[PDB]
Symmetry: D2
Subunit: 339 residues, 4 copies
């Protein structure tokens, strides 16, 4: 048999991501085997260990899956912290671990803009917010800021200033100036919340110069439940992937089955799927040391294009060809031309 | 048959590129037809027309191509301008023109980073160059900053100032130098030694570049600086990528370039279009081509119906960050 | 006497900038002489010349100011084209020309962030504009025929129109992004929703929304009333305050870029004739070469090599090692 | 009398900064009083406490400074951490602290380019360094690389690869070896520089041996020389006095920390002149919204958060006319 362990935060803080990771792995393996769930006569079984995103539990689960269930290889896990704990548990069992999503037994999944994006969101959440109010000088504006003010109090951001202008201010040079001076050199997030029945007139003044964003805009508040109450809706980071044969299958099949698009994490589990399946097929065995040999320098296909494990650090890199372009001809042409 | 016309500056100012376009196009057709050079029982012939990168010549060549040789579809051309002259000829002749590399009969090739880069290089050549020299205050630092002064005098850059220090790879030196080049447009301190480092530790926060670095000069024949200027870019590997690079190398003993891959896509589009249309009639081709995805060495492209522009054919993925963020705090 | 000529496009396309330039020059000279309009006993006299931003008029006008009116020194002019033409006039008259705001005889005002911003706006207006429409499936269609009409006097192109039922604008916004993608020039989604769309960060396609700031080229042709301004901040200083206090006091408006510009030039001339203790061209070129002078912008300096004016500055550095070595430990 | 406390890391880890902070504080006071070292009849006294950059020492030193010495106000201190421990102390004593350089009693010094540069270097120093080797394939390339390997090994960086060509494909191998690692990725050349540069490593986030401050500012990596952030300041009457005098007295330029100490001194003298007293309460009142001149121009304390900000005038330009022009 071919036993793959998946350590993941099935319950707890990262439970939503953990769902995707498995669904992705199951579809990942299904593609790679053309639906047979067997690789070279070998039946593929998958053993899942909820580690509740707890580093102590994760270690025991990882130890358990190698030792008790006899998993040949492992993927995991949801939480970064937990996965770091697990690195030695791999060496301890002289069996490979693929880190996903989060020594010679560890293969890492790769750098990408989505993690960058998450790290970004994370820092933001871990920083201050300073808000600056803008409203009209009649009851509704002042009631308006009242309620917002009340929402902003369960929050932890600071309100530096409230500006109230007349119902009919069509020129906001002075307000906006007063607003920029209030948020100026603070960190971290500085924001002007307009309540109205001005974003435009204010955006023309270019607030970015101060690092100030306005209440109209995408995801200008930290991805915390406290703020998502003034602003409903989850914070998403968007990205695009050049179509390929695994893309199509994943997107079509996933949509078809769950009436929803695959996500970044879904695609991660699927990639680990390809790594394992590609590797075992390469090595023609499931012996750790023959597996490491196959994988070092191995290219494998993912929903994201061709990947390759760098042998030195066991890291997944996007797999390229290099091109260049000679620009002299076109420049010596372009000049001998405007004259 | 299936007749395809390639217009290009086979000779003249853009001749280096023209050669890539053709090799590329020849190779695209081969890959697409598994070497048979026939599509759906149709034999594929290619007609080439040298327009010398002259608009007047290129208009005739294109007319001639359709009218005299019965080209069912054209590709071209090398020069941006000779290509603008050509747009009407396509319309006047009621046939398709795929514009490469440079109305309803025009289909374009997409925006990419090589073009931007060619763009930039062009802009640079059309702007000023100011130089400040840094040398040693003795015989051959001073003699070698004459050799240069001499060379630099046949180019078109101004020499704003000469600094001669003793041996002082140093601070006061490179400040006299920054203050000298500062607020000029558009383009360099040129070191002659037997300094760079110490200088580089201070920054370019001035727009200043050193004589170390790649392509700090305009890419002009006039400008110790041997060598062509290149813009480098990496592409995610794929089945056409591989075939191209592998075969090009094995054939030509050198990598395929941007204009090679450009020709390849031109070819992929024509073949995919004619396999889709099941005919070579202009109108049934315009219909097949609007919104059709085709495969190229850069991945899947697709023609936007609205403007006949080639776009990278994408899927859209999102990531929800709340959970992770909610996590990092607690 | 001390005779100053100011060339400017007083009437014509750049007339707004001209009044600015004059006011500042006049206020510049006034601040500089503590209201006496006399520099070291010399009476200061200013001759203006409308060139209407026409280059061949502007050469005659400058020529007339040196020759007929006997100006010791000139300043001009409102348009860079008209002022490239004037360079030889000044040489052929053996007299200094201070180029503002736009030979050993020319001297320049400096490169600043507000110039760059104009070069920006100009590139943009000289570029294409493409727009895509989003509205409710009703007054959408009506309101996007009134726009379709308006935009038609414009010169932009309408790539697509998207109508949706009055909820979740993912698929819609995507259709909109795919529609505006790799086009050159400006891309804009004009909505008849906004936030949902902004959450998908259009910046990453080069697409602006119909909410951003100055999404359209500054052209009368472009709903969207109001002028396009580039904003920027200068650190207070004694000249600053005076300019801002008096200008705001006399005109109920703050000094703008062009007003401060005429001011700077005013400060240069005064500083020069005082340091030269004369008005002889040869001695003025001498005085100004490497010369420092205070402006509303701060302390400036004339680079001898190229007669360009630079922010005059001190250099500081900071050693990071001790602090870094601390952090790790 | 007017009594001012300077808390600082005169000895220990931040001793060089502390020295400059003081020098600046003394000259700031000199210039402010035209050498008289008195303001409105008050002799000016300065008391220094070495906190050694120890936070527990520092809350003590500042405690002494207030309670024992009678310091009517305080400036400090060298460490950010020791400065943060000190915040309560000011409050606990009903006396003002100015945080420099690192409560309605705290007044801060401003965010700025130099501090952001320091913060930067710090981050960098707490991050990985990866190296890739390039030398000729003969005797003293391979030896020189050993020498370097010997040095690099007292470091904490990793040598991922060693490339030996004789005297494009090389620098391709090189780039691929460093591509997606964090943080610093460096090709070390022993001898080429120019050819590699032609290929623009920046697009892999890779730097070369030739370069300006490519290594963290740790003594192990120091490749001699200190690491500097360079910046420029618009000349003013204070600039000039400072630079000129410090250059006449110490035969070396003033630095970020000297000017910092100068600004602190300016805040105080300006404040105490404006208040006409040394009373904490009347001082907090005077300082809010207060403008004062420093070696880098006019600052003002923002009331809402007691933060110093470069004091600005806002100017704008209207571009329609010139675009409308450019087109027609």
């Amino acid at each position: 048999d071919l036993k793959i362990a998946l350590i993941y935060g099935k319950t707890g803080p990262l439970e939503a991501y953990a769902k995707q990771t498995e669904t992705g792995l199951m579809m990942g393996l299904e593609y790679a085997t053309k639906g047979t769930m067997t690789l070279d006569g070998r039946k593929i079984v998958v053993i899942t260990k909820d580690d509740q995103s707890k580093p102590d539990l994760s270690k025991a689960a990882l130890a358990e899956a190698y030792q008790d269930d006899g998993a040949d290889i492992a993927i995991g896990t949801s939480s970064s912290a937990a996965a770091l704990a697990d690195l030695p548990v791999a060496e301890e069992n002289k069996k490979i671990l693929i880190v996903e999503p989060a020594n010679r037994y560890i293969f890492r999944t790769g750098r990408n803009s989505s993690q960058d994006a998450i790290s970004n969101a994370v820092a933001i959440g871990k920083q201050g917010v300073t808000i600056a109010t803008l409203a009209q000088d009649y009851a509704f504006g002042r009631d308006g800021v009242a309620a917002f003010k009340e929402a902003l109090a369960k929050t932890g951001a600071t309100l530096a200033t409230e500006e109230y202008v007349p119902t009919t201010t069509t020129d906001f040079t002075a307000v906006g100036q007063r607003l920029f001076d209030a948020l100026k050199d603070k960190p971290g997030k500085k924001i002007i919340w307009v309540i109205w029945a001005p974003l435009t007139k204010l955006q023309d003044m270019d607030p970015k110069r101060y690092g100030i964003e306005l209440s109209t805009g995408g995801n200008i508040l930290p991805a915390l439940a406290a703020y998502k109450r003034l602003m409903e809706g989850a914070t998403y980071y968007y990205y695009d992937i050049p179509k390929n044969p695994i893309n199509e299958w994943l997107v079509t099949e996933h949509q078809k089955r769950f009436n929803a698009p695959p996500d970044f994490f879904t695609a991660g589990g699927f990639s680990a799927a390809m790594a394992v399946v590609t590797a075992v097929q390469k090595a023609k065995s499931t012996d750790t040391e023959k597996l490491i040999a196959a994988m070092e320098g191995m290219e494998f296909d993912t929903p994201k294009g061709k990947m390759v494990f760098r042998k030195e650090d066991h890291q997944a890199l996007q797999s390229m060809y290099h091109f260049k372009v000679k620009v002299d001809p076109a420049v010596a042409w372009a000049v001998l031309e405007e004259g």
